[PDB]
Amino acid sequence: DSCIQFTRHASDVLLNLNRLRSRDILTDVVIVVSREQFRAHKTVLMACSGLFYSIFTDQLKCNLSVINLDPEINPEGFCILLDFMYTSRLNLREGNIMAVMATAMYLQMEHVVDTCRKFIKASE
Amino acid sequence: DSCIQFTRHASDVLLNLNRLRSRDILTDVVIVVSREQFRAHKTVLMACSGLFYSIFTDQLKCNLSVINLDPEINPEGFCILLDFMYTSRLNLREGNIMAVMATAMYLQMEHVVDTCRKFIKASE
Amino acid sequence: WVIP
Amino acid sequence: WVIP
Ligand SMILES: O=C1Cc2cc(Nc3nc(Cl)ncc3F)ccc2N1
Ligand SMILES: O=C1Cc2cc(Nc3nc(Cl)ncc3F)ccc2N1
Ligand SMILES: [Cl-]
Ligand SMILES: [Cl-]
After folding, report:
1. Residue A38, SS3 per DSSP
2. Of A17, B40, B89, B111, which cross-links A3 as Cys (Cβ 3.0–4.6 Å)?
3. Touching partners of A (3+ C-beta pairs < 8 Å)
4. List of chain C residues whose C-beta atoms are within 8 Å of the C-beta of residue B90
5. Any residues with CB less than 8 A from the CB of B46 and at least 6 apart, and which?
6. DSSP output for B35-92
7. Closest residue of B to D3, CA-based?
8. Which residues share a beta bridge with C2?
């Protein structure tokens, strides 16, 4: 087409979606990861994760307001990935990399799994 | 912090949100602009428009599934701006620029109003 | 704004 | 991936 494009638009949208999450505005699901609860927007979760895409496109599960994750999932790993979904920034550290990679494999976040594998390979 | 950042993440999220809109997945509002209806996600509308931010943060209006816009609003102008919200690309043409600018002023989309004013100034 |  |  003959369109013009605003370079910063996608980043500005994501920043605003994170501000809505912070202020608990229009969050429509609670993700339970053992004893912890995380509020989020179903659409952002689906846009970032192959697992959430499959869950919320399912005719029965799309209507649930609470989703319980597998008990093997580490809440800190999930928290780091949820922050990544809303900000593009991944808080990857020697002390959390294995939990983050395991959580990203479960959530089906291929780009995160890729960077974790590379950082692990560099340590070996 | 000591974060790493995935450059393409925000653009990839927006592309996926537009794919959900296309497939009518988890759209939760209908915007009525005279005889036309547009389905969208409340969170994306709020992230892009000062008008929708004010509407969906209001305790009564946040619960509405249908929003009727002012009858002076042109449906084509709205359609062009809705596509911009979901893609960062603005289909600005000599034949639609006045309707687009008027709609962006009403929706409170300051960056769109700015580019329309500049293209109009260049024509004069 | 840019030409994409 | 980059250093932001
Ligand atoms: O690593 C990943 C990240 C990821 C996100 C999605 N999300 C969606 N995919 C499509 Cl095609 N349309 C809408 C979506 F919200 C699906 C699979 C995967 N795998
Ligand atoms: O030209 C514009 C675009 C625009 C978007 C928003 N959106 C939100 N603003 C904040 Cl601070 N937090 C969350 C949001 F969804 C407000 C005002 C304006 N004015
Ligand atoms: Cl990813
Ligand atoms: Cl704008």
Report:
1. strand
2. B89
3. B, C, D
4. 1
5. A16, A20, A25, A26, B52, B53, B56, B57
6. TEEEEE-HHHHHHH-HHHHHHHTSTTGGG-SEEEPPTTS-HHHHHHHHHHHHHSEE--
7. B4
8. A5
